[PDB]
Design a protein around this ligand. Structure first.
Ligand SMILES: *[C@@H]1O[C@H](CO)[C@@H](O[C@@H]2O[C@H](CO)[C@@H](O)[C@H](O)[C@H]2NC(C)=O)[C@H](O)[C@H]1NC(C)=O
Ligand SMILES: CCCCN1C[C@H](O)[C@@H](O)[C@H](O)[C@H]1CO
Ligand SMILES: [Ca+2]
Ligand SMILES: [Ca+2]
Lengths: 88, 858
C-alpha cells in the first residue's frame, strides 16, 4: 500500500538514522553529517550560502554562537544576535 | 633575586629583638584579682614581672568552635592599631563560665561544653581543650613579648637604617609576639605568599617565614622570603583533627615553626598593633574553612568569563595587535575570553588614560571585542605620575588624598612613570574617589566589557626600602605605614572591585586581578603568583603556591602560563597550558623582553596539545562555576590538597605534585621535560577512579604509573561524582553559556553518584538580588539518575537542556526511560561499550530547570 522513505546514512557510513535525527541538535554521525545546520557536532561544518557572492564554510561551533560569521548572517538564526548582510 | 635588597630577620631590629627571646619561664603573669567576666568576654590584667607594664587580656569564646585572644596595653601612650575592614561581622560570642578555680588557675567552660579553656596565672598560659583532649597551648614556651610604647623622640630600636634608607621610628620599639603549641600536629600549612612547599618547613636552622607584601624581582624557589601577598592564617592537620590560627595583624610579621608525643610550635612576631588571634578548633578541615569564612568572608563569585582563558603579555602593541590576536584565536580554533592590556596601553603610565598613537579609539576596539563576545582587561596601578597636566594627579593632590611623609608633604617615589605619588587607600574617602573614577563618564574609553588588573599594589616603590614605602610614611587617622602595610593592596583591590560594581549601577559582578593581598582578599576577585620564570621548577611550584592560597580562602589563584621571565621551550609551554587549564585563574603572560608566545606561533603538534587543553577547560566551565559557587556560599576551596579529601591518609599530607578540584577530579599534570609517564597516587579504601580519557577504572589506594604523550593531562574522575560539561566548545564562554549540558556520572562501587550544578546569567548579582539562578542536584542510585532542586529559592529562565549522559561503571540496560512533569514518558536510545562499562544516553532533551528521572531497566 504506502511505500516508506528510506533513512539517512551518514557520509562516513558509521550509522543510519531516521530523518528526524537530521538537524535535530544532537550529533549522531562521527563525521558530523547529520548536523549541517546546527552546532551539535564537534567536527561539523555549516555552509554560508552567501547568495550572489562566494560561499564559505564555517565550524559548526560557530552556528548560533552570537557572532556573525557568514557575510549573509545565516549562521545566526536563533541566537539573539541579528546579523546584517555584509556580503558586498 | 638580589637577597641583599631584602631584610633577613637579623636586619629587621624588631625580629632580632623578638627572636632573641628564647624558650623559658615567661615574665608575664595574670593578676586574677582583676579578672572580670561578662556574657561576651573575660578580661584580666597581665603584668611583666620586670618592667611592671600592665596589659589587658580579652578572652572570648565564640560560636562555631573558635576562641579569640586580644592583648593590648592597659594605659597606652597612644592607641595601638587594630585591623579594620578584614572581618565581615562582629563575631557572634559564646559565654565563658567558671567551672574551676584556685590561687593560680581558672578553668572556663565554653557555653555548655565540650570546649574548655584553662587560664594559668603564673606564668601566664592558656590551654584550649575539647573535653579531655588538649588541642592547643598559648605561651607554653614563654615566648610572649609585648614591647610597650616608651616616651617619644638598643641598636636600631629607635632610628634605623637599611642600605641607604632611614626609618625615623618616632614610637620606637612596639613589637608584639606570642607562641602556640599544637600537640599531635606534625603538618602545618598556609601563611602565603612564599615560593615554597605546601607543607611548611621548620624554621629553626634558618629564617622565619616572612609576611610583608613585597615586589621581589626574579624571586627564587624553596625559601621563606616574603612575596607580594600575606595571609596570616596557619592550618594544622593530623589524622585526628584540624586546627587553624588566624593572627589578625597588618604589620610586618615573622613566623617561626619548630617541632619536637609529636608536636609543632608556632610563634608569630609583629612590628606593631595589638595581639589579636583567632583559634579555629575544627574539628574537621571543612569546619575550619567555615570558621575562617565566618570571620573574613568567602570567595567573590567570579563572572563566568573570568574562569575562561586569558591572553596577556607585556605588551600588546596597539589596536591592530589586539585585533590580530583576537583573530588569531578564531583562525586557529582556540578559545579565549579575555585579551589583556599591560602598562604600554596608557599615556606614559598615567593610569585611566590611553596612548593616542597605539590606542586612538578604545571604544571601537572594545566594540570589536564585544562583537566576538570577548572582554578586555586594562592595568590600573596605585601610583600616580606627579604631573600637573594629569587630572587624576591634580584631583588627588588638591584633595590631599596621597600618602604623606612626617613633615606633611605628599610622599614621592620613583616608579613606572618616574616621580609618582601613592593614593592613601586606607582612607575610606580615597577608596570612594577611586571607585567613582571607574564610572564610564570618568574613565573615558572604558565600556562594560573592560575589566581591571591591579599590579604593584604592595605598594611597589622603585626607589624605596625593599622596593616599598618608607615605614614612617603617614596614613589616614595618623597611622604609620608600618601599622597598615599588609592591607594596602587589599584596599586597592576592594576599591577597584567596588568601582566596577558601581559603574554598572550595582548590577554587574566585578573582575579584578590583584598582585598584593591579605586575609579578606578573596572577597574582591583573583590573585596570581607574580613574576615567575619560564622554568620547569616554577611550573611545579604553581601547585603548592595556589594550594597554600586555597587553604586560607583565596580560591581564585593562578600563575603566569609559560612563566613571566625568559622564553619557555615549546614542550614547557604545552605542559604549562595543561597545568593552567586545571588551575582556577588561567592566564598566559610574559615579560617585555620575551618572544611572542601566542599559542598558534608554535609547530602544529604543540598547537594541537594546547588546543586540547583549552577545550578541556572550556568544557569544564559548568564544573568550575559550580565549585566557585560552593566557595562563595560555604568558603570551601576550589583547588584542594589530597589530604583535604583524605584526612586519615598520612601518605597524602605532603603531596604537592597532584591536587583535586572539589571532590570529583584528581589532577597530576606532567611537569618534567621528556616525561613518558607519571606516578599517580589514587587514594581511598574502597574508592574507584576513572581515567577521564580512556574510561579505565582503578581501585584505590594505589600508585599507578600512567603513560603520557605531549597531549596527555592525567585526570581522574572519582567514583560517586557527577561532573557537568558543555561539550560544544566555542570561541568564548559567552558563546557557550546558554548551551546544553552533558553529565558525566562516575559510579561508586555501590553504584551511586552525586553532583551539583549552579547556573545563572553568567555575570550579574541577579542570583543574590532576584534569586535568579539554578542549583541542581544530580543523584544516581540503584538504577535511577534524578535531577532535583538543591535550592528551591533559585528560579531561572534558560534554554539550557540535558543533551547527553555518560555513565562510567554501568552495565548494558534493556531500556532507558525518562520521566519529567508535563511530558509523556520518554524512551532514550543508548550506546554501551562492554570493555569499559561506559553507557551513553542519547539526547534526554529535558530542561536543566526541571525535576526529572532516568531509569535503567535490565
Ligand atoms: C564543633 O565541635 C564539635 C566537637 O568537636 C563538633 O562535633 C563533633 O563532630 C564530629 C565529626 O567531625 C563527630 O564525630 C562528633 O561526635 C561531634 N561531637 C560533638 C560533641 O558534637 C562540631 O561539628 C563542630 N561544629 C562546627 C560548626 O565546627
Ligand atoms: C617593573 C615594572 C612593572 C612590572 N609589572 C609586574 C607585573 O607582575 C607583571 O605581570 C607586569 O607585566 C609588569 C608590567 O606592568
Ligand atoms: Ca542528529
Ligand atoms: Ca556565528
Amino acid at each position: 500500500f504506502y511505500e516508506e522513505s528510506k533513512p539517512f546514512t551518514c557520509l562516513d557510513g558509521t550509522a543510519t538514522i531516521p530523518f528526524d535525527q537530521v538537524n535535530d541538535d544532537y550529533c549522531d554521525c562521527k563525521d558530523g553529517s547529520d548536523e549541517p545546520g546546527t552546532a551539535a557536532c564537534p567536527n561539523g561544518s555549516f555552509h554560508c550560502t552567501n547568495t550572489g557572492y562566494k560561499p564559505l564554510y564555517i565550524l559548526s561551533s560557530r552556528v548560533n554562537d552570537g557572532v556573525c560569521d557568514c557575510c549573509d548572517g545565516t549562521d545566526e538564526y536563533n541566537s539573539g544576535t541579528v546579523c546584517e548582510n555584509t556580503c558586498r | 633575586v638580589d637577597r641583599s635588597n631584602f631584610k633577613t630577620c637579623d636586619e629587621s631590629s624588631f625580629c632580632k629583638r623578638q627572636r632573641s627571646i628564647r624558650p623559658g619561664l615567661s615574665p608575664y603573669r595574670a593578676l586574677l584579682d582583676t579578672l572580670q567576666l561578662g556574657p561576651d568576654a573575660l578580661t584580666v590584667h597581665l603584668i611583666h614581672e620586670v618592667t611592671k607594664v600592665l596589659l589587658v587580656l580579652e578572652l572570648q569564646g565564640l560560636q562555631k568552635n573558635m576562641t579569640r585572644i586580644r592583648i593590648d596595653e592597659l594605659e597606652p601612650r597612644r592607641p595601638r592599631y587594630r585591623v579594620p575592614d578584614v572581618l565581615v561581622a562582629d563575631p557572634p560570642t559564646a559565654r565563658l563560665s567558671v567551672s574551676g578555680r584556685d590561687d593560680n588557675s581558672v578553668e572556663l567552660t565554653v557555653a555548655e561544653g565540650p570546649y574548655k579553656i584553662i587560664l594559668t596565672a603564673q606564668p601566664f598560659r592558656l590551654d584550649l581543650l575539647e573535653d579531655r583532649s588538649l588541642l592547643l597551648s598559648v605561651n607554653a614556651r614563654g615566648l610572649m613579648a609585648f614591647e610597650h610604647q616608651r616616651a617619644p623622640r638598643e641598636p636600631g630600636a629607635w632610628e634605623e637604617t637599611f642600605k641607604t634608607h632611614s626609618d625615623s621610628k618616632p614610637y620606637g620599639p612596639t613589637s608584639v609576639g606570642l607562641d602556640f603549641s599544637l600537640p599531635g600536629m606534625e603538618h602545618v600549612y598556609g601563611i602565603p605568599e612564599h615560593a615554597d612547599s605546601l607543607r611548611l618547613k621548620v624554621t629553626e636552622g634558618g629564617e622565619p617565614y616572612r609576611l610583608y607584601n613585597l615586589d621581589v624581582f626574579q624571586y627564587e624557589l624553596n625559601n621563606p622570603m616574603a612575596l607580594y601577598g600575606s595571609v596570616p592564617v596557619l592550618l594544622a592537620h593530623s589524622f585526628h583533627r584540624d586546627l587553624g590560627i588566624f593572627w589578625l595583624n597588618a604589620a610586618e610579621t615573622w613566623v617561626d615553626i619548630s617541632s619536637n608525643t609529636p608536636q609543632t610550635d608556632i610563634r608569630w612576631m609583629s612590628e606593631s598593633g595589638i595581639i589579636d588571634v583567632f583559634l579555629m578548633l575544627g574539628p574537621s578541615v571543612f569546619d575550619v574553612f567555615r570558621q575562617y569564612a565566618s570571620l573574613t568572608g568567602t570567595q567573590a563569585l567570579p563572572p563566568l568569563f573570568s574562569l575562561g582563558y586569558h591572553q596577556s603579555r607585556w605588551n600588546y602593541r596597539d589596536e591592530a595587535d589586539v585585533l590580530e590576536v583576537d583573530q588569531g584565536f578564531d583562525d586557529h580554533n582556540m578559545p579565549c575570553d579575555v585579551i589583556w592590556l599591560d602598562i604600554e596601553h596608557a599615556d606614559g603610565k598615567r593610569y585611566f588614560t590611553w596612548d593616542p598613537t597605539r590606542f586612538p579609539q578604545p571604544l571601537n576596539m572594545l566594540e570589536h571585542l564585544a562583537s566576538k563576545r570577548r572582554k578586555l582587561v586594562a592595568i590600573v596601578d596605585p601610583h600616580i605620575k606627579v604631573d600637573s597636566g594629569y587630572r587624576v594627579h591634580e584631583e588627588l593632590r588638591n584633595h590631599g588624598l596621597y600618602v604623606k611623609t612626617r613633615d606633611g608633604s605628599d610622599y614621592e617615589g620613583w616608579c613606572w612613570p618616574g616621580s609618582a605619588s601613592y593614593p592613601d587607600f586606607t582612607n575610606p574617602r580615597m577608596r570612594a574617589w577611586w571607585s567613582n573614577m571607574f564610572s564610564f563618564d570618568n574613565y573615558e574609553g572604558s565600556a562594560p566589557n573592560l575589566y581591571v588588573w591591579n599590579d604593584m599594589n604592595e605598594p611597589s616603590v622603585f626607589n624605596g626600602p625593599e622596593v616599598t614605602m618608607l615605614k614612617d610614611a603617614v596614613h589616614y587617622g595618623g597611622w604609620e605605614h608600618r601599622d597598615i602595610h599588609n592591607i594596602y593592596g587589599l584596599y586597592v583591590h576592594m576599591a577597584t572591585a567596588d568601582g566596577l560594581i558601581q559603574r554598572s549601577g550595582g548590577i554587574e559582578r566585578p573582575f579584578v586581578l590583584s598582585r598584593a593581598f591579605f586575609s579578606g582578599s578573596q572577597r574582591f576577585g583573583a590573585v596570581w603568583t607574580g613574576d615567575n620564570t619560564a622554568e620547569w621548577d616554577h611550573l611545579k611550584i604553581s601547585i603548592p603556591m595556589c594550594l597554600s592560597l586555597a587553604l586560607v580562602g583565596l580560591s581564585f589563584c593562578g600563575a603566569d602560563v609559560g612563566g613571566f621571565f625568559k622564553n619557555p621551550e615549546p614542550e614547557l609551554l604545552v605542559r604549562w597550558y595543561q597545568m593552567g587549564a586545571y588551575q582556577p585563574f588561567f592566564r598566559a603572560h610574559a615579560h617585555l623582553d620575551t618572544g611572542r608566545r601566542e599559542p598558534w606561533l608554535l609547530a602544529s603538534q604543540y598547537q594541537d596539545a594546547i588546543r586540547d587543553a583549552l577545550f578541556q577547560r572550556y568544557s569544564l566551565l559548568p564544573f568550575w562555576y559550580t565549585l566557585f559557587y560552593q566557595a562563595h556560599k560555604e568558603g570551601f576551596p576550589v583547588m584542594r590538597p589530597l589530604w583535604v579529601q583524605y584526612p586519615e591518609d598520612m601518605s597524602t599530607f605532603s603531596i604537592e605534585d597532584q591536587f583535586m578540584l572539589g571532590d570529583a577530579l584528581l589532577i597530576h599534570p606532567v611537569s618534567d621535560a621528556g616525561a613518558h609517564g607519571v606516578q599517580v597516587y589514587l587514594p581511598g579504601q574502597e574508592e574507584v577512579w576513572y581515567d577521564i580519557q580512556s574510561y579505565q577504572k582503578h581501585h584505590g589506594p594505589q600508585t599507578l604509573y600512567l603513560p603520557v604523550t605531549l597531549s596527555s593531562i592525567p585526570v581522574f574522575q572519582r567514583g560517586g561524582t557527577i561532573v557537568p560539561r558543555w561539550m560544544r566548545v566555542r570561541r568564548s564562554s559567552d558563546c557557550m553559556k546558554d548551551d546544553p549540558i552533558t553529565l558525566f556520572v562516575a559510579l561508586s562501587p555501590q553504584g551511586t553518584a552525586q553532583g551539583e550544578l549552579f547556573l545563572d546569567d553568567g555575570h550579574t548579582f541577579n542570583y543574590q538580588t532576584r534569586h535568579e539562578f539554578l542549583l541542581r542536584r544530580f543523584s544516581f542510585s540503584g538504577s535511577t539518575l534524578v535531577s532535583s532542586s538543591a535550592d528551591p529559592k533559585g528560579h531561572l529562565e534558560t534554554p539550557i537542556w540535558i543533551e547527553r549522559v555518560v555513565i562510567m561503571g554501568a552495565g548494558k540496560p534493556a531500556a532507558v526511560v525518562l520521566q519529567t512533569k508535563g511530558s509523556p514518558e520518554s524512551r532514550l536510545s543508548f550506546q554501551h561499550d562492554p570493555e569499559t562499562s561506559v553507557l551513553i544516553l542519547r539526547k534526554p532533551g529535558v530542561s536543566v530547570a526541571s525535576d526529572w528521572s532516568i531509569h535503567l531497566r535490565a
